Amino acid sequence: DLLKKEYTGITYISGPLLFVENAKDLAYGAIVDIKDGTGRVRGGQVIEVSEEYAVIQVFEETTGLDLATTSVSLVEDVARLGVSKEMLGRRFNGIGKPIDGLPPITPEKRLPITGLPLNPVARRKPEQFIQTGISTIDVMNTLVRGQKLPIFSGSGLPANEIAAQIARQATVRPDLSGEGEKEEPFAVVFAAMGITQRELSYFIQEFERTGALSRSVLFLNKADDPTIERILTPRMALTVAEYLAFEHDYHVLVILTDMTNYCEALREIGAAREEIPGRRGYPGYMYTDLATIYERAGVVEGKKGSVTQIPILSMPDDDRTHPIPDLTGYITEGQIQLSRELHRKGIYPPIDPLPSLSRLMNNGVGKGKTREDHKQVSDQLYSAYANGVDIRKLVAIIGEDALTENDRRYLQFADAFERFFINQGQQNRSIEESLQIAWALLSMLPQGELKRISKDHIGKYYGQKLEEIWG
Amino acid sequence: KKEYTGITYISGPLLFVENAKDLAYGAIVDIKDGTGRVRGGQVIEVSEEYAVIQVFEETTGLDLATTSVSLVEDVARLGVSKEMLGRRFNGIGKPIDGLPPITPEKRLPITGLPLNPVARRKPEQFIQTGISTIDVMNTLVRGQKLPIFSGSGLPANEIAAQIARQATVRPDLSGEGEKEEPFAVVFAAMGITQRELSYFIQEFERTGALSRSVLFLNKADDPTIERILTPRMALTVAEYLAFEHDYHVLVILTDMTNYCEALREIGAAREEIPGRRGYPGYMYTDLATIYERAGVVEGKKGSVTQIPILSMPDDDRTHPIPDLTGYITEGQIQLSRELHRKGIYPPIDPLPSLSRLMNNGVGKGKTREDHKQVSDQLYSAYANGVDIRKLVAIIGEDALTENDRRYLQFADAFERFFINQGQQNRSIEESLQIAWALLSMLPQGELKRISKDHIGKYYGQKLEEIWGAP
Amino acid sequence: IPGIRAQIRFIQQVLEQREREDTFRLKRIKGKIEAREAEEE
Amino acid sequence: MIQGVIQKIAGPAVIAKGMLGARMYDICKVGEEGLVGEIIRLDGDTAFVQVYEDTSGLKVGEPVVSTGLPLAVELGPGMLNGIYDGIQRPLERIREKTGIYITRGVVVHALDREKKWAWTPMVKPGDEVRGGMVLGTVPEFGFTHKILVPPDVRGRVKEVKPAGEYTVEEPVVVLEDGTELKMYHTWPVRRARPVQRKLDPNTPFLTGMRILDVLFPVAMGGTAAIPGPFGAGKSVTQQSLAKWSNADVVVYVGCGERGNEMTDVLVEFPELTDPKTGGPLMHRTVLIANTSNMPVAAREASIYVGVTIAEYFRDQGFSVALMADSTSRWAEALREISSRLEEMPAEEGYPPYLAARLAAFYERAGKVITLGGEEGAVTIVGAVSPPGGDMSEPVTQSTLRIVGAFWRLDASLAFRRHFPAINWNGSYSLFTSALDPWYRENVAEDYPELRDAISELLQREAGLQEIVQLVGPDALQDAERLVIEVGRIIREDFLQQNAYHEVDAYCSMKKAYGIMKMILAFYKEAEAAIKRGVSIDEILQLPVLERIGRARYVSEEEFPAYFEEAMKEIQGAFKALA
Amino acid sequence: PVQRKLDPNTPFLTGMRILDVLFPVAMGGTAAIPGPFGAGKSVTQQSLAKWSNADVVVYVGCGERGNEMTDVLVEFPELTDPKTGGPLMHRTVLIANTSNMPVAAREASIYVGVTIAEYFRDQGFSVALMADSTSRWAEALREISSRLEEMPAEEGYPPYLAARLAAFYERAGKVITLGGEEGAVTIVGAVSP
Amino acid sequence: PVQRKLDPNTPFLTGMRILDVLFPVAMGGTAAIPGPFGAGKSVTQQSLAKWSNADVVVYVGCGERGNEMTDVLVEFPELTDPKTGGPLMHRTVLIANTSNMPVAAREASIYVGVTIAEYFRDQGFSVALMADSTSRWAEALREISSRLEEMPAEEGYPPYLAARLAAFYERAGKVITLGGEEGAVTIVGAVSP
Ligand SMILES: Nc1ncnc2c1ncn2[C@@H]1O[C@H](COP(=O)(O)OP(=O)(O)OP(=O)(O)O)[C@@H](O)[C@H]1O
């Protein structure tokens, strides 16, 4: 435990891998230190071991290594990260080292970065409504505390802005929930993999403006940093998040900037090891890896904290059938999918409601949680918007002049919906204002066309005009 | 006799056995485990270093220390007899009906030989399936390879059973004719479920068709190699009967999509890089060795006729299975989901169906002189009726001419009384009568494709002859 | 109709290319494993 | 016992040397902590072991021991109301021993060995016993659980315990040959439990959903597959079947899916009521949860454990429903395994034997005469998760060739929040013709004809939708617009169902018959009106359509009166039009 | 071998006005015809054989169906030579293959036919070679290449399909034989996509 | 290395109305200009070099036409620096690895150009870096990985292609130099899909 065991006998350095011969006493998954001839130390992890040799994945670049002056030493058998309450207000890199000038943190515990699966019996039901301030999320794709709700983005779409806005505006509404008023904010664990300087400066300035750096832990893996380092960043971030939530009663919001980059690192390692790959060259176990990451959210019986995840990924050619978005959606509890068509029209946030989803929305809406009309109003909005898009496809065939009055009304509804309900800029809307706007838009259709809403709610809320809100 | 115990590798479906240079390529072997259970397998590679055995079923209890391999036979053979009629087998030829095993007249290699092209002769006589849409519009000729293209949820099994129950030859219709000619049906079912197995057993037993049939039934949970062997054994029996006992043999191969999936699986199990769309690069040759085992030979009274049945994977005729099958076969009978969901049975759609050899097995001296023109006219009239049916939805019935309206009525009558025969057994004369009754709805002289003699002779029948039995 | 034909051609090309790439990968991996078996069994 | 040492560790795969004599697919204890593994390859003196747990921290040279037996399930009293892992570890006991996390190397008995059971013998000394006979009985949550002779056991009874309270370890019956039969036995999980004969299904499996029970029925011993992309509502459908089906016992297998879906069942079912018994719903339920971040090799185990438990409850003479949350995850686990083994893939990387394994699993379903002469049944509903929503994937296509019913889900409908979101055109059932006698005897004499009329209407609407997409809906003639409108009425008032409603979450067959009859009568009267020259606009404004549209929400007790009023009102409304 | 390959300056008269006028083929030329079903390709090929100015005819069936091959083998014997009135088979060499005959034979069929054609050319005759279903020959080639474990190109065909077809078709031509006489081989292929 | 990375706040004026107005680039930003052959990549980049408001231009001809390098060499010495007033060539560094020059040197050319640009930034200059085609750099990496016997990702390229591209593009930025002055490197990247 206190004795240093070195392994000369490196027989191969190529790409991110390194073979060492007589290392039969290196555990599977152990962390190692690779010392070069000039005394520089670089890290790696044992990913295969046999009597013949051990395969090490190097976390840095391999420049300057030689098969004569390099040695591998054992750091620890199981990859662990020292955690403490004092991680708040600190900035670390992809392997959890300080990058802000302060000294290293004194651990209260060292936890395995891989973690362990939460027992399903131990889990709670995620039920607390979070008010993001974005109407397309609050009304139609509600976010509940304990949920894993990613953002499916494009190349030039504003996903970082949406994530920053959600962090800035997200709050629970104890007044509606019937719970005693309490002012516990969100702690934000922010993990960036392959993030450019432009996006990072945006996020950092936004947090500094909001004053959220004091209650944030940042694991930053930039785009000029080693790619294989990205394998550990999400796991370190989620180790810290789980620790804070389920040992210190924090309500943690975890932002994972770009999961496409993580998948790129995974594919790199898979190809180096000559594994038989799956789709588009990605490893066949990518579902399991992504589940090891995403399933570290939720809420636990008998504990007050929570972990909420909002991964952000870029669908490569705006392609939802690409393996990364596809597997993610199969793992996560919904998705908020942006649209380039709305973005080009100038609509912000450019959230397209039809392809978005929130699995747990029914858990945290309705009488005693948000308002008794919420679910039916969301259903009615979906139906009306779908009819509008269909009539848009129809005008290209028949021509506008041939439309019926109801078809024209649905066209007008679709336009107004996009321009007033989805387009809200950087404004923070309460669920009450969002439902008011939704009802104003629904009042543009005849009261008998609202078949998903009960007549009690139609009596109570139908009628108000949009001009009363604006203009 | 000799037992090989030098087993040095077991992985998935394969086991390697050393010091086994005495095993022929493609020999069938028995695998005995420590518990005493006996499995089966086939030699798929032999070298001076070891032989590779593909194991039927599962390699669960096998160990390298107690397993022993023995030779059953060098070449897969099937003992055949005329006593195989009325009997049910399991895909490798083992009885599954509980009656005693058959004593064979001879044992034959299941992968028979290719027929000499110069010993073949033209198909010239027809098989009456009892189904009007086939007998009249897509005739089946003795020696033909006529597949049924089905879909996911369509009643292909019922149609197969109906043809098996009704199929017959018509010696009386062939000029002077003959008193009787033997007829047999060989039914190969591959990858079927328990429900389908029970349905087939009951169908063959209730109507008595079992007495003139041989059934090779392979379940979906049986070994894949048995699926591969089932059609070969069926056709070996068919060739035996036809070309050594002058039988007229009809072969129904119930799911060739299942056969091709099994072929893909076995190819992957022998470490062969898949060809187009995952299927083996030799799929064409294998499907040919199966399909091409039908025909009519010069100097022999018998014949072999095949009806493969395929479920087009996603209604795609461009899928490799149906593409290759069309390349090898001589037409296709296409089922339709529109007709099925409208209640019509058998849901055979005449428009996309064709029998390439129909013209050589219909006409004077075989069926009736009016057959070809009646078929052509029915096709044209039905196509016009369907087009007018789409046109009415837009321009209404008033904007149609009287002839367009008559075609509109004829199309519905055709669907209701010609296609929709239920579980009836219609002789060719009854089907031709129904066809003439339907054509009588159109005005004489609008039947361009029929000579005036036939019109004079048969035109004028009344729909009441079939109105009471849709 | 020409637009649909162009889309069909494009999708066919993409799918065939993906199949070709996967096949090349399998051949490469199996060849390398065979070489490894030859070198060290 | 066969013993050896680790030679190589690559992820969940361990190569152990010195294992000569080890058998294929036998369980092995790996490492110093005895991690449960399985032998999947034998190569000279080496064996390829799949660890059912995480292998991080293991070292070369650690011992590997073989149990000499394949994966087996403990079958007997103590499973209902229980939640298990993939290899039948109770999760409540893991929760007590471990904290809120699952740790490796926990050994816990499947059945509780300290709970006592009220044994009532049903054999007496000198009685012959054969596999599957009933020796006695035990109460469990309103079921008369019956102890069965293990299938491969024979002999004559020497002594029988008197009626009393004993643990499941008690040798309740002793045979002259010396065999001591306890309340439970062990069965290899990959062997189908034998039955006397399999019977042709003739009774429906009522899920409470109109579209499935009417248009796409599944029989009691049948198999259904429900494929779809994420968001289309597979989990909601499976849970509705768990809540509302007419099966005596429900087995729920969470193969490699979200853990919140298991939490939902655990939290909610205890508060719900069994449709027939009346007691708590969780008392008729067995959960097998192997979530997505739990060991990959345990997914195959979860599927086969579930099917074995279901076959046991069938051997007891029950009707059992088995729900597989995703067979796609089972297939992906197989693919991961094969890639680790460096096998030759087929199609999208799957092992060649995937189709055979699916077929073997789905052929364990059915209605049977048990070895005891009773009648039990297993109905399997498996969900498929094609990548990209592509139904041309190998898994979906291989399922499509062995199942009886195919409930295709549509992304377009799920995007509009139209649930159940079944693609009518792409769905089918092979059980309709076999269930007609039952429908005539138990729903209504003309139910089959009404169902067929609905189907013909839907096919006509599908046919005219092409013209509608070509020329728009207003260009159609009156009769065709009526067909389009009645198809829409069917879609919104009959096929649409609200799982979260208090009444509409469940529908009886008679309520479905009533709604169908309403819609057909309306269609006939509208056709007659149009032939007499009534505008469509005036037809679609008739208020009786609102009654037809609200029929879904009428409680089961009030529905008959509502239906009679509506049948009178339709005739009145189309008579008043004159 | 030949001594010289001459130019395409003389016509190959099929006897059919449409081909002989609108779309002529020269002596030593090459033509391709697609075979749809029901288009009467068989009668057209038979008339080319009957009435062409070719002295000898080589008909290669490379991978046909069994019944199409039987049709060919039962019809040609009964055809009559317009020049002599004797059986047309007396100036015809026929190569017959079926789909279920060895793939090597189906692959070598066109080569055997062309070699025979060139022999009769070197004797100083005009020979018409008709290869029915070169698509089936390409299928045989694709299968052979798969069995040799070669990297496929395009729809699974080997990357040398075009070159093999070119080498085959370029054996056609009008030549001066090594013996100093004029002889020709004219190839008419068929394609069935 | 640099002291600090700044936020781009001034425009990279190009001389093209469309790029300057609708789709601008900041003085230390990155742009990609992909296009099919014949669309105007080379003309656009040469115009960037002739008219841009950068102090220094490093123009990297990675695996492209040699006539383009000759065109630059011949023409620029006669044009005038828009701001300095001297000859345009005097503000330009040319790195040329044409298409028929060795393949592996394409990667070296990219890295050499970006390092020189960083150097001139470190002197306090605003530097424009034009990469004539990063597609040819990707092709070189694919070739070398073929020789290494590595396993490819999509379309044969090595899986670390995105990492290399990212590392190359992240060297752009407005910065505070270690000497305390303000520098900037702007990268425009041509891709030839
Ligand atoms: N020149 C012709 N003069 C008169 N009738 C002809 C002529 N050419 C063809 N036909 C007739 O047209 C028919 C064409 O269709 P058919 O299906 O019979 O042709 P096929 O030769 O069997 O088919 P394929 O195109 O596959 O060779 C020929 O069978 C023959 O009946």
Numbering used by the authors:
A (entry chain F): 2 to 472
B (entry chain D): 5 to 474
C (entry chain G): 169 to 209
D (entry chain A): 1 to 578
E (entry chain B), F (entry chain C): 194 to 386
Authors' description from the paper:
Vacuolar/archaeal-type ATPase (V/A-ATPase) is a rotary ATPase that shares a common rotary catalytic mechanism with FoF1 ATP synthase. The thermophilic bacterium Thermus thermophilus (Tth) possesses V/A-ATPase, which functions as an ATP synthase in vivo. In the V/A-ATPase, the V1 domain (A3B3D1F1) can function as an ATP-driven rotary motor and ATP binding, ATP hydrolysis, and ADP/Pi release that occur simultaneously at three catalytic sites of A3B3, respectively. This cooperative reaction produces conformational changes in the A3B3 stator, which induces a 120° rotation of the central DF rotor.
Therefore, V/A-ATPase was added to the reaction solution and incubated for 5 and 30 s, respectively. The structure referred to as V1ATP reconstituted from 54 K particles showed ATP binding to the catalytic site on ABopen and sulfate binding to the catalytic sites on both ABclosed and ABsemi. The V1ATP is an intermediate structure formed immediately after ATP binding to the ABopen of V2SO4. Consequently, V1ATP is apparently in the state immediately after ATP binds to V2SO4 (lower). The structure reconstructed from 16 K particles was identical to the V1ATP obtained from the dataset of the 5 s reaction. In contrast, V1ATP was still identified in the dataset from the reaction mixture 30 s after reaction initiation, suggesting that the transition from V1ATP to Vsemi1ATP did not occur immediately. Together, these results suggest that 120° rotation does not occur immediately by the zippering motion of ABopen with ATP in the absence of ATP binding on ABsemi. Cα root means square displacement values between semiclosed B subunits indicated a significant structural difference in the C-terminal helix bundle between V1ATP and Vsemi1ATP when superimposed on the N-terminal β-barrel domain. The C-terminal helix bundle of the B subunit changed to a more open conformation upon ATP binding (black square area). Considering the difference in ligands between these states, ATP binding induces conformational changes in the C-terminal helix bundle of the semiclosed B subunit.
